[PDB]
Amino acid sequence: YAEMLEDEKNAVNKFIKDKGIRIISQDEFEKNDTVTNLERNEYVALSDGVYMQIVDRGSAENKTDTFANNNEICVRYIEEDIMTRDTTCFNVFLEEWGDANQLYTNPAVFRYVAEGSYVYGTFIQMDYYWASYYQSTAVPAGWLLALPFVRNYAHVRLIVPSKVGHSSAQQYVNPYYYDIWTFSKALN
Amino acid sequence: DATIRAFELDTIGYGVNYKFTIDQVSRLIYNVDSLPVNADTIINSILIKTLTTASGIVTMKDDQDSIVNINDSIDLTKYVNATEKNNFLVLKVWAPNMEVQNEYKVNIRMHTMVPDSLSWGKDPIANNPVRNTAEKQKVVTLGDKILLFAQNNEIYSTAIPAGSPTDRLNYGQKWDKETTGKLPDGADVTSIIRFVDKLYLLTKNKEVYNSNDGLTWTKDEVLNSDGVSVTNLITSFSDSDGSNHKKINGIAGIVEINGEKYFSFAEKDVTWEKDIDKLTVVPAEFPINNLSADVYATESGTLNAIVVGNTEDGLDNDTATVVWASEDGKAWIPMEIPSNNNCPKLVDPSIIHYNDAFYICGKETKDDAKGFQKFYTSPTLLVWKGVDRMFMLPGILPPVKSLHESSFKGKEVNYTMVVDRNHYIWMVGGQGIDKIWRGRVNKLGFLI
Amino acid sequence: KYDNWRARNEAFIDSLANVYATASGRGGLERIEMLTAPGNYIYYKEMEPMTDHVVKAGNPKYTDYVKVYYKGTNILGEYFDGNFKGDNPVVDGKDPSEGDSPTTIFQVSGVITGWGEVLQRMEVGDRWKVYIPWDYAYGSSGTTGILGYSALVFDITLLDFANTEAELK
Amino acid sequence: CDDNTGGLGLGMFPGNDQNIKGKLSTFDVTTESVKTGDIYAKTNIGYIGKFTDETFGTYQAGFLAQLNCPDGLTFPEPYKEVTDASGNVISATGRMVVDDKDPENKDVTFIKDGNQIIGNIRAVELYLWYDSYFGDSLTACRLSVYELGGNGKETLNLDNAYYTDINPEDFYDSQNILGTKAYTAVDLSVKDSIRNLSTYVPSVHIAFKEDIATRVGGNILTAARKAKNADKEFNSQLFREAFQGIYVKSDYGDGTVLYIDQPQMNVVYKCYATDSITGKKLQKKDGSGKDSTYYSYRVFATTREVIQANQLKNDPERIDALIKEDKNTYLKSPAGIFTEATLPISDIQNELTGDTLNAVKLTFTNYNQTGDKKFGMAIPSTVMLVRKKFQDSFFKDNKLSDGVSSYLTSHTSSTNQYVFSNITKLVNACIAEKEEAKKNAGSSWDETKWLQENPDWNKVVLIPVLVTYDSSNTTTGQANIIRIQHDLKPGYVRLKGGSLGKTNPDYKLKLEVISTDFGL
C-alpha cells in the first residue's frame, strides 16, 4: 500500500461515531466566546485536521499567563491508539499501574518555538516511557496548535492525524488520541 | 645506519609491565621502578621483546661473540643491581652496513626489601626506663628530643639526629633522666599537649601549666581565667601542622561554664572564649578520658583534626569507636557510620594519620579475643577495615624457617605512642610489655 | 616563491655547515654529533638561559618525557607551529593582545629525529635555536603545512623532563 | 585551455573598479571588572558543599526544594475482612496491614485519625542522586537536612526563588531537623564491582529515625486519606500542606560540591498478599508462619513542576577587593565577577563611513592558572558576549543567542584566548540605533548630551554560560542549541587589560576591523 494508508479518516470517523462526540467548526468555536461544551461533548475541527476539546482553559483567576515563544512547557498525558483501541503511552498515575513508580514520577518537558512561521517544539526531558519506547525528541505538531487557545495549567483532549504526529505516527500512518491532563510553565 | 631502540620486557605480574629508560649518550639501560622482592624467582627464566633496531643482528660477549636468541627466554638473575660489584648484561649492536659499532650495558634494578611493609625489626630497640612500670605513661616530641613522662614527677628523654628522613639514621637506643625533673604539683600526665614551640599540661585541680622545653614548668597568665574552668585540652592548630588556608592558630579544649560543658578555643596568646551565647555544648557521647588526637592538611589545603578516646562509663546503644572531626576549634562533629563498616569498641584507643591513610589501635574486650589484636585502617575516615597482612602490630615476625615475647599482640596493658618527624612509629609498653618498639614502613625511607 | 625548494634548503644547511668551519667566532654556531648517523652534525645557536630553572641537572633520555616552550619556522621565517608566536615565549606578558604561553609535553622517542637528537643534550632551562636537515625532519612528502623536503628551524626552551607524565604535568 | 590572463588588463579598467582597496585598522577597547548583581539562575541542579581557595576565599552552597505529588496518587486501601453470621471469613478487600497487638506487626508503627487506624509506616528515606561533583573525592564531609515551613516563616514562590542569595533562616526552623549523613562523593563503602555498573548512579542515602519517620509519614498518609475520603484528588498543593519541602545544609567538610540532580523521598509501608479471586490473605508457603506480607512504597520527588532554589555564597570582602584590581579583570563564575568592555563605536562610525565592513574581531586573552593545584578551579569553557542593555533580560526571557546582539565562543587553550572573530552585526546595530536617534531629533540634536545619557549604548559584558544541545538528527549531525543559562559550577580565569587602561595605554585592548574601501 502507498495511498491506501491515508484512509486514517475512516478510522477517525469510526472513533468519533463510537462515542458521543459533536464537531464544531473553528468559525463557530471562536464566536460563542470560546468553549467546547462538555455536557454535549463538543470538539473543534482545528487546522491540519486536528480535533480538540478544552476541558479546562486554565488559570481562570489570573487569565494573563498564556504560553508564548521561548517557554519551556511540562506535559502530563495518556496516549490512546486509534487503529487498535489500546493505551500506548502515558506518564500519569492510575491505580491499575500504581506501583510502577518509574512510569509516572517524571514529566515530559519541551521548548516552545514560535517565530514568524513554522511553529515547532523540542523535548528537553522525555519521560521514561517515551524515552524508552519512541526515543525521539520531536514534539507532536498537533499539540502545538492548541497552545494559542489555552492558558497555564490547562486540560485538553486531542485527536491527532498522521500528518502532524510523532516520528512513529508519521511512518506507520496511525492517528492517536491524547488526554493532556496538564500543560504547565516549567518551574526551576 | 642507525641504532634506534625500543627495548621492552613482558608481564612479571599478571598485567604488570615495567618501563625502561634508554640513555643513548651514556650507553646504558635500566628500569626506574625497581622490581619487587618476589621477582628473583620469576626472572629466573623470562622473555625479552620489542628489541627493535635498524638491523636486528646483536651479540653478547662469550672466547666468542655469540648471536642473541631474541625469540627465546633468558636467565636474568645474574644481572640484577649491577651498579656495584658491577656485572652488567653488556651486549653489542651492529649497524646495517656493519661499519658502525656500539655496545649497551643493561641493569635490572630490584628491591632488597618490600616497599609497603612495616618494619619493626627482630627485637625491641630499648627497655622502658620508667621505675614502677605499672604507672601511667605519656610520650611527646619537642624540637629534636622525644620525651617520656611518668605520673610520679619522673621524666626521661632521647635526642634525634640532624635531619633528612631519607638518610641512614639510627637513634633511640639510649635514654636519659632529665635530672632536674619536678613536673608540677597535682599534674595529670596523660593530658600533655603540643603547640608550635611549647608544651601545655592540666592538673587535677584544673590549673593549666606550660613549659618551653619540658625541663621546668610554670602556671600561665592567659589561660587561667576566673569564672571558667578547664576540664580537657584536646589539640592545637597551627601553621606547623599543615598548610591551613583558613589561618587558624590556637588550642582547643572543653570548659565547664556555670556547671555545663562547652567546646572552646583559645586563639594565639588570648584567653578562652567564654561567651555562652556563641559556644557549643559537648554531646554526651563525646570522649572523656585518655584522649588521642591528630591534625593534618586536607587535599584542599585546609587543616582538619580527628580524635578518639574513652567514653563515659555507660550509655545506650554504643558498640563502636566513632571518630570525631573538626575543621576548626569551635565545634566537633562525629563520623557516625550507618552500615557494618564501623570499627569495634576499643579501650584506650589511639589514632594516627600516616602514609596517606588513617590507622587506629587499641585493646578489645570481647572475652574470646581480648587485648591488642590488630590495627584498623581507613582510606576515607568513614569505612574501617582490619589489616590481615603487612602493617601488623609489633613483634609479629614472618617465617624464618612467630610471636616475640615482648609483643603487643594478645596483651592487655597500659601504653602510649607518637609519630616523629622522620615518620617512626614509637610505641611504649607498661607493666606486661616493659619495652620500647620502633618502626616505619619502608616506602617512606626510599629515595624512589 | 617556493621554486626549487629542495636545492635551496640543502644550500642553507651547507651555508651553516661551512660558516662554522671558516667564519670568525664560528659565526655564532655550535654543533653536536648525531647518534643515529655518526659523522653527521646538527647545528644550533646558544641563547639567553632561563632564570626559573627547576634545578634538574642532567640531560633527558630517549624514552622519557619533556616539557617545553617551542616555535617552529621554515627557512623564510614563516610560522609552522608552536606554543608562542612572537620572538619570545610570553609569561606575565604586558601586552594585552597576546596571552601567556601554555607548556606542552612530549616524549623524546615520539618526535622527529632532529628533536630526538638535540633534546638528549640540553639541560633544563637552556634556550637553543636549532637548524635541522630535511633528512632528519619529517622529510620527503612532509606533514600538513609542510611543502616537503623542508629544513625546519626551531626555537626550544627546556623547562622540565621526567620518566612519566603524571610527575611532570 | 587557459583561464587566467594573469594580471594584464588592470590599468585600463574604469576608475571605480581599479580603485577599490582592502584595509586593516584597529581601535582601542577598555575593560573592567563589574559586580554580578541579582542574577536569575533558574536551574534544576542543587549545589551542596564547601571549599576554600587561596585567591577567592571560602565558597559555600546549599539548596531548598519542594517535593511533587502526581495527580490522584494514593496509598493502598486498608485490608478489611467480611464475615458471615458464624464469624467465618468469606471475603476481603484492601491491601494495607491495619491490625495491631499482633507480635508479628511490631516491625511498623500504626497511624490514626480520630480513633481509627488508617494505615502503617515502616520507614521514610531520602535519596539525593547526583551524576558528578567538583573537587576532591576522598575528603569526608557531613550534610544535614531540615523540613521547610513553620510558624511565621516564609515560603518559596515565583518571586522569592531564583535569586542566588536568599537567606534560608527565614524559610525553615532549626528544630525541624530530619537527619544527617557523612559522605565522600565516591562512596568506598560500596564494592567496586557495583560501582562499575552502567546502571549505577551515586547518591547520599539519609533515611530518618523512627520518631521523625512516624511524624512525616503519618502527616503525608493522613493528608492522602483526607483527600480521598472527600472525593478530591491528592494534587501537589494538598501534599504541600503535609510536607512543605526540604533544606539541605553543609555542616562540615572542605573540598566537595555535589551536583544533586534529583532529591527523592520514599514512604514505605507493609502490605498483605491477597488472593486473586476471593481477596483473602495468603498463608506463608514455608513451614509454620501466620500470614504473607511484603513492603511497598510511594515516591515523592522534585520534578520541575515545583520550585527549587539555591544559596551560592561567595566571600563578599574578597570579591569586592578583587573587583578593585586595575591591572586585570576576572571572570569568577558562580555569581561572582563579570567583565565589561566599552566598544569604540563612534570612532568606527566616523573613520569607516562609506566602507563595507568585512570583519570586526575582538579578543580577550588570559594568564595561566596558578598554584598547580590538583583539584583547583577551571577556566570557563564557554562564554557569552552580550550588549549590556540585555544583560539580565536575556536570561529572564530565556532567549537563545541572537547573532545581532550576542555571541558565543569557546576557550582556545592552545593560545589562551577567547576570540569572537566577527561582531559586525552588533556594530551595525549600535550605529543604526544612534543614527535613528539623531534622525528623530533633527535640528535639536546634541551628540554630547546623547552620549552623556544612555551611557550603556556601546557597552558589552562577558558572561560564563552553560550551553546544552539537542541529541537528535544525530547521523546527519547538526547539534542545535536549546538552552543557554548561567554557569554555576565553580570556575574562574584572569584576563588581561583592566581599569588602568582608562588612563594608561599599555593596559588597553585592541579591536581589529577589516573593510573594503571604494575610494569614493
With CA atoms as reference, report the closest residue to C108 among C71, C50, C65, C48.
C65
CA–CA–CA angle A122, A126, A131 (5° rounding): 120
Cβ–Cβ gap C63/B4 under 8 Å: no
Distance from the Cα of B84 to chain D's closest Cα (Å) equals: 39
With CA atoms as reference, report the closest residue to B389 among B398, B380, B381.
B398
CA–CA–CA angle B271, B275, B276 (5° rounding): 135
Name the residue type at position D446: D
For D287-293, the CB contacts below 8 A with 24+ separation are D290/D102, D290/D104, D291/D104, D293/D97
Local structure of residue A3 (DSSP, 8 states): S
Asked if D233 and D224 count as a contact pair (C-beta separation under 8 A), the reply is no
Beta bridge partners of B440: B119
Local structure of residue D139 (DSSP, 8 states): -
- Dihedral sign of CA atoms B51, B56, B60, B66 in order: positive
Cβ–Cβ gap A70/D399 under 8 Å: yes
Residue D12 Cα to chain centre, angstroms? 65
Cell numbers 609552522 correspond to what residue? Answer: C80
Name the residue type at position A146: A
Cβ–Cβ gap B298/D254 under 8 Å: yes
Distance from the Cα of B99 to chain C's closest Cα (Å) equals: 11
> Distance (Å, rounded) from C-alpha B104 to C-alpha B3?
11
With CA atoms as reference, report the closest residue to B297 among B349, B337, B238, B252.
B238
> Distance (Å, rounded) from C-alpha D158 to C-alpha B196?
54
> Distance (Å, rounded) from C-alpha D407 to C-alpha D363?
13
- Closest residue in chain C to residue D367, using alpha carbons only: C100
3-state secondary structure of B255: strand
> Distance (Å, rounded) from C-alpha B23 to C-alpha D313?
54
**CA-to-CA dists, residue B319 to B81, B306, B316, B336, B344, angstroms:** 52, 19, 9, 12, 7
Q: Residue C41 maps to which CATH number?
A: 3.10.50.40
**CA-to-CA dists, residue D301 to D129, D245, D263, D304, D366, angstroms:** 11, 10, 6, 9, 43
Residue D385 Cα to chain centre, angstroms? 20
Residues 6+ apart with CB under 8 A from B247: none
D252 part of contact set with chain B, CB < 8 Å: yes
Q: What are phi and psi of D501, to 5 degrees?
A: -65, -15
With CA atoms as reference, report the closest residue to A90 among A177, A185, A21, A188.
A177
**CA-to-CA dists, residue B49 to B11, B32, C64, angstroms:** 11, 18, 19
Q: Which cell numbers in the block locate residue B141?
A: 616530641
Name the residue type at position D220: I
- Dihedral sign of CA atoms D206, D207, D208, D214 in order: positive
**CB count in 10 Å sphere of residue C89:** 23
> Distance (Å, rounded) from C-alpha D83 to C-alpha A149?
55
With CA atoms as reference, report the closest residue to D304 among A102, A111, A74, A101.
A74
Domain of C104, in residue numbers: 5-86+100-162
Number of domains comprising chain C: 1
For D281-289, the CB contacts below 8 A with 24+ separation are D281/D79, D281/D92
**Least CB–CB distance from A70: residue in D398, D471, D480:** D398
Q: Which cell numbers in the block locate residue B344?
A: 569495634
3-state secondary structure of D467: strand
Task: Tally A–D CB contacts below 8 A.
Answer: 72
Strands B65-67, B58-61: parallel, antiparallel or unpaired by DSSP? Answer: antiparallel
Is A touching C (3+ C-beta pairs, cut-off 8 A)?
Answer: no
Cβ–Cβ gap D306/A187 under 8 Å: yes
Radius of gyration of chain B measured on its C-alpha atoms: 28
**CA-to-CA dists, residue A49 to A46, A86, D353, angstroms:** 6, 22, 54
> Distance (Å, rounded) from C-alpha D428 to C-alpha D311?
40
Cβ–Cβ gap D296/A99 under 8 Å: yes
Burial of B214 (0-12, 13-18, 19+ CB in 10 A): buried
3-state secondary structure of B37: helix
3-state secondary structure of C73: strand
Strands D172-183, D203-205: parallel, antiparallel or unpaired by DSSP? Answer: unpaired
**Least CB–CB distance from D304: residue in A70, A138, A187:** A187
- Dihedral sign of CA atoms B267, B271, B272, B277 in order: negative
**CA-to-CA dists, residue C121 to B2, B20, B444, C31, C58, angstroms:** 18, 19, 33, 11, 9
Domain layout of chain B by residue ranges: 8-107, 118-444
Q: What are phi and psi of A6, to 5 degrees?
A: -75, 10
Asked if A99 and D296 count as a contact pair (C-beta separation under 8 A), the reply is yes
Is B touching C (3+ C-beta pairs, cut-off 8 A)?
Answer: yes
Asked if B351 and B308 count as a contact pair (C-beta separation under 8 A), the reply is yes
CA–CA–CA angle D11, D13, D16 (5° rounding): 110
> Distance (Å, rounded) from C-alpha A45 to C-alpha A40?
15
Residues 6+ apart with CB under 8 A from D343: D29, D362, D426, D427, D430, D458, D459, D460, D511
Q: Which cell numbers in the block locate residue B50?
A: 620489542
Mutate to test the interface with D, among B303, B382, B383 (most CBs of D within 10 A): B382
Considering only CB atoms, which chain C residues are within 8 Å of B19? 63, 163-164
> Distance (Å, rounded) from C-alpha B263 to C-alpha B232?
10
Please say whether the structural domain B118-444 has been given the CATH code 3.30.70.2500. Answer: no
Cell numbers 500500500 correspond to what residue? Answer: A1
Considering only CB atoms, which chain D residues are within 8 Å of A135? none
Does some domain include residue C93?
A: no
Instruction: Report how far apart the first and last C-alpha atoms of chain A are (Å, whole number).
Output: 48
Asked if C9 and C150 count as a contact pair (C-beta separation under 8 A), the reply is yes
- Full set of structural domains in chain A with CATH: 4-59+68-185 (3.10.50.40)
With CA atoms as reference, report the closest residue to D509 among D450, D462, D440.
D462
Cβ–Cβ gap D253/B301 under 8 Å: no
Considering only CB atoms, which chain D residues are within 8 Å of C102? 368, 413-416
Cβ–Cβ gap D415/C94 under 8 Å: no
Cell numbers 533633527 correspond to what residue? Answer: D442
> Distance (Å, rounded) from C-alpha D173 to C-alpha D170?
8
Does some domain include residue C113?
A: yes
Asked if B240 and B143 count as a contact pair (C-beta separation under 8 A), the reply is no
**CA-to-CA dists, residue B79 to B7, B29, B67, B104, D275, angstroms:** 16, 12, 18, 13, 79
**CB count in 10 Å sphere of residue B137:** 22
Q: Which cell numbers in the block locate residue D263?
A: 532529591
> Distance (Å, rounded) from C-alpha B358 to C-alpha B325?
13
Considering only CB atoms, which chain A residues are within 8 Å of D72? 92-94
Domain layout of chain D by residue ranges: 20-39+314-517, 63-310
User: Structure resolution in Å?
Assistant: 3.3
> Distance (Å, rounded) from C-alpha C1 to C-alpha C20?
28
Residues 6+ apart with CB under 8 A from B402: none
CA torsion angle for D341, D345, D351, D355 (degrees, to 10)? 110
Q: What are phi and psi of B417, to 5 degrees?
A: -155, 160
Q: Which helix (H) or strand (E) holds D228?
A: helix D210-228
Cβ–Cβ gap C38/B4 under 8 Å: no
Radius of gyration of chain A measured on its C-alpha atoms: 16
CA torsion angle for A121, A126, A132, A134 (degrees, to 10)? -10
> Distance (Å, rounded) from C-alpha D302 to C-alpha D148?
14
> Distance (Å, rounded) from C-alpha D517 to C-alpha D520?
8
Residues 6+ apart with CB under 8 A from B323: B306, B307, B308, B334, B335, B351, B360, B381
Name the residue type at position C37: A
B204 part of contact set with chain D, CB < 8 Å: no
> Can you give the length of chain A in residues?
188
- Going through chain A in order, the beta strands assigned E by DSSP cover 22-25, 42-45, 51-56, 72-76, 78-81, 86-90, 108-113, 120-125, 154-160, 176-185
> Distance (Å, rounded) from C-alpha B263 to C-alpha B251?
11
Beta bridge partners of D120: D110
Q: Which cell numbers in the block locate residue B238?
A: 597551627
> Distance (Å, rounded) from C-alpha D71 to C-alpha D74?
9
Cell numbers 591534625 correspond to what residue? Answer: B295
